[PDB]
Design a binder for these strands. Structure first.
Ligand SMILES: [K+]
Ligand SMILES: [K+]
Ligand SMILES: [K+]
Ligand SMILES: [K+]
Ligand SMILES: [K+]
Ligand SMILES: [Mg+2]
Ligand SMILES: [Mg+2]
Ligand SMILES: [Mg+2]
Ligand SMILES: [Mg+2]
Ligand SMILES: [Mg+2]
Ligand SMILES: [Mg+2]
Ligand SMILES: [Mg+2]
Lengths: 49, 48, 49, 163, 48, 177
RNA sequence: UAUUCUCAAACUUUAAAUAGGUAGGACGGUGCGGCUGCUUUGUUGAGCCGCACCACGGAAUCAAGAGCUCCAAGUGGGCCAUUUUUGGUAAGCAGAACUGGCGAUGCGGGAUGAACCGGAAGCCGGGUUACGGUGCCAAACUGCGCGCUAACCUAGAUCCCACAAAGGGUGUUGGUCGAUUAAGACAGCGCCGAAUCAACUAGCCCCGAAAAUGGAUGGCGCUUAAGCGCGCGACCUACACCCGGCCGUCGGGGCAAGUGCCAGGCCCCGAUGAGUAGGAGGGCGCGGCGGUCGCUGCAAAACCUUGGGCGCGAGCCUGGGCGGAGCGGCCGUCGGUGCAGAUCUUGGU
């Protein structure tokens, strides 16, 4: 007994019931993933500020 | 104009006194949809 | 009812004549027709000649 | 993976422009990128390193990191019922400085100048620009009128250049 | 004052049209700045 | 006096630009039930024949044309092109009426009746008042008679109004010519 | 060598429409000073940090408001439609894209129908419409107008839709291009006398057109149509729109030196009402327990009744009868607590 394989029918309606949610952007963003050397220097500068 | 217009609740008009011609067609083709320019006034008379 | 109404003329005679001439010219151009000479293959059918 | 390779369906997207292949102009490597800059992602098909995924091609994002050869870009991506700020690293060859905010600073400066002038003369003004509105009335000089009429039909002219 | 203004605007428009005709040219009326919009279809089967 | 079809002279031009400070002004004589539809058809023709759209065009003037003497009979000729189920064709027709508006209404009705051509499938190329001697159709030429005489062959029997209408009558109608 | 007919999902210089991304300030700008182990030949830059000043809110429209978190149900067979579209001769076939719909949804129209058209809904009065209609069935004209058709085939009669083609017609109705003609057009006898010949085009009609119970424009019928194409007025018709009444829900407001209140109350003001699976709130009903207030041989429970009334409802109160010994209201609390189904169990019919 074969069945349907795939479809995107009704998915946009589901997404729009509560979406499309845009996360609130804060003034300061996380520094994870940035150049480690630059972050090290910035931390030292803040320490001696 | 913006503040005054927003202050006005959307007007709840009655059904046209004389009916409509055809709402599935543009006013240009003899229907009712679209810009009917100065002739909207008579429709308003019949709808108010 | 009294039939004693005044004879009021807002526009003087010369300007009234000018207005009438302008209106007549405007009507003349309003009812004017094209010469239909651009359709050479249909000159006989259109009655130009 | 899962039925589609990394560069699947990129025959046209990742190809280079006609008669624009070969060496890359030096202007690409002389650009300056800084945090907060808006950039456009345009994949150069000749640079196979630091290539963004095809999805990010043709999308504009903001710079959040600056390495030796690449720049970090944050690009919005819609996944079902929310928008994800996906952070990627892309080589400068694949990125171009965006003009999406070129007029902002100019407009702000002019608004500040106009507001200062209005305050000097003791007036209150709005510096907001407005959409094009209706034009006022005007007089048009009469000229020779050319009459337009419908064209008599001729079947021989139904073909481009005639039958 | 508003009633007087409305009458004056109507008279001015008529006079402008007449003067344009007299001069042999055309007067283009100012484009409408205001519209009244009436919904004529129901709320069933609506596109987003 | 109400006519279904009115004749308008619509005047318009392309929006002035730097290249064209004074663009060519175009005029048309059009038939429509309203001035709004007349302007719509004017812009349709301008777009199709002169490459001037309504969006980048200017409306200058629109005036109704009324018959000079609606109290007298005239012969009207109409040159038109219409679309059939299988193509386009040209057609010349003649009518007799007191006004050209009535002649145009007759033309629309006759096209609908004889060729099943809807109103939007008909384009009017030319109109003119034809003298009696220059008429080409026998239908119009048959009433060019100084002494025209015929009986009323078909007359419908009805009361002056529905006030006097009755379901039953004592005698059958008495008809004669 | 210069031309030329015709082409591409896995060709392409060029290249739309629709759709995709970004930005349009209070997380801004300007001027000084400071931190660094990073960077520079270079306090050269890069970030960050303090001080001082400015910043009419920096496009439109809307904003029945915005954000965040926890626990959890059901679902994980779908199907249909315009447009795009793959395999297949095709399928009421099989498979994809966007959107909508049915499923879960009644209501008016399409005779009839899950999907078409209209339109979505608390209980009512009045008015007006949507789609569709106004010869009867059947509410509204045999209304006012113009042409076409005559079916000796069951003429024809309204999106989906309940099919018809290529070829034809000297049936009839309009148009297009040609030829002859009052120095006389064509047929019959040089007489005779005013129209004649030919090809295309497309409306209606006809041929093309054969199946099994008797029968389907829905039926009857309809031809100065009640058929076909196009108009004009006036009418009919939804649970849709407008005004009013009432019920519920949601939101807002008023009420204390309290003449002051089931404040868990009363009063006032706006908007609004579809619901399967599923969730929740407030209530109705049964049998015990802890308390409290009562009824009953001057007749309890149970049962019976075209007696009566209250509540939207679950139910409740009561007249009358029968019965002949117990029973109920209220506040808490508890449970083997509510049946139309299960080829359900037992008994009875
Ligand atoms: K599940
Ligand atoms: K025929
Ligand atoms: K008790
Ligand atoms: K009882
Ligand atoms: K209890
Ligand atoms: Mg309303
Ligand atoms: Mg539709
Ligand atoms: Mg696409
Ligand atoms: Mg619909
Ligand atoms: Mg009602
Ligand atoms: Mg029927
Ligand atoms: Mg028990």
């Amino acid at each position: 007994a074969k069945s349907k394989n795939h479809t995107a029918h009704n998915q946009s309606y589901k997404a729009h019931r509560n979406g499309i949610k845009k996360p609130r952007k804060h003034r300061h963003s996380s520094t994870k993933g940035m150049d480690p050397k630059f972050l090290r220097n910035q931390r030292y500068a803040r320490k001696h500020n | 104009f913006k503040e005054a217009n927003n202050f006005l609740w959307p007007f709840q008009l009655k059904a046209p006194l004389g009916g409509l011609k055809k709402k599935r067609n543009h006013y240009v083709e003899g229907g009712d949809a679209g810009n009917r320019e100065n002739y909207i006034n008579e429709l308003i008379r019949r709808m108010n | 009812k009294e039939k004693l109404d005044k004879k009021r003329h807002q526009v003087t005679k010369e300007e009234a004549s000018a207005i009438r001439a302008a209106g007549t010219s405007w009507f003349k151009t309003m009812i004017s027709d094209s010469d239909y000479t651009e359709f050479e293959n249909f000159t006989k059918w259109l009655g130009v000649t | 993976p899962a039925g589609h390779g990394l560069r699947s369906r990129t025959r046209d997207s990742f190809s280079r422009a006609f008669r624009k292949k070969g060496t890359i102009p030096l202007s690409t490597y002389l650009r300056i990128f800084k945090i907060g800059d808006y950039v456009d992602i345009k994949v150069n098909g000749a640079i196979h390193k630091g290539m963004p995924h095809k999805f990010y091609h043709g999308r504009t994002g903001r710079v959040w990191n600056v390495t030796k050869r690449a720049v970090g870009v944050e690009v919005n991506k819609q996944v079902r019922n929310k928008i994800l700020r996906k952070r990627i690293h892309v080589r400068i060859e694949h990125v171009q400085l965006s003009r999406c905010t070129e007029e902002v600073k100019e407009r702000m400066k002019k608004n500040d100048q106009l507001k200062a002038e209005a305050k000097a003369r003791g007036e209150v003004i709005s510096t907001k620009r407005q959409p094009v509105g209706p034009k006022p009335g005007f007089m048009v000089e009469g000229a020779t009128l050319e009459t337009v009429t419908p064209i008599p039909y001729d079947v021989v002219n139904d073909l481009k250049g005639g039958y | 004052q508003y009633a007087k203004e409305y009458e004056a605007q109507e008279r001015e428009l008529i006079q402008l049209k007449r003067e344009a005709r007299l001069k042999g040219g055309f007067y283009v009326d100012p484009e409408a700045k205001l519209l009244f919009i009436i919904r004529i279809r129901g709320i069933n089967a609506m596109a987003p | 006096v109400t006519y279904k079809f009115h004749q308008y002279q619509v005047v318009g031009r392309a929006l002035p630009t730097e290249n064209d400070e004074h663009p060519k002004i175009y005029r048309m004589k059009l038939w429509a039930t309203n001035e709004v539809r007349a302007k719509s058809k004017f812009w349709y023709y301008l777009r199709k024949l002169k490459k001037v759209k309504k969006s980048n065009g200017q409306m200058l003037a629109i005036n109704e044309i009324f018959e000079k003497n609606p109290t007298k009979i005239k012969n009207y000729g109409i040159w038109l092109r219409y679309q059939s189920r299988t193509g386009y064709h040209n057609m010349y027709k003649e009518y007799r009426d007191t006004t050209l508006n009535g002649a145009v209404e007759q033309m629309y009705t006759e096209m609908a009746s004889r060729h099943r051509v809807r109103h939007h499938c008909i384009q009017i190329i030319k109109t003119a008042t034809i003298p009696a001697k220059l008429c080409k159709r026998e239908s119009t030429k048959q009433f060019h008679d100084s002494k025209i005489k015929f009986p009323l062959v078909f007359k419908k029997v009805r009361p002056p109004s529905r006030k006097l209408k009755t379901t039953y009558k004592a005698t059958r109608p008495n008809l004669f010519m």
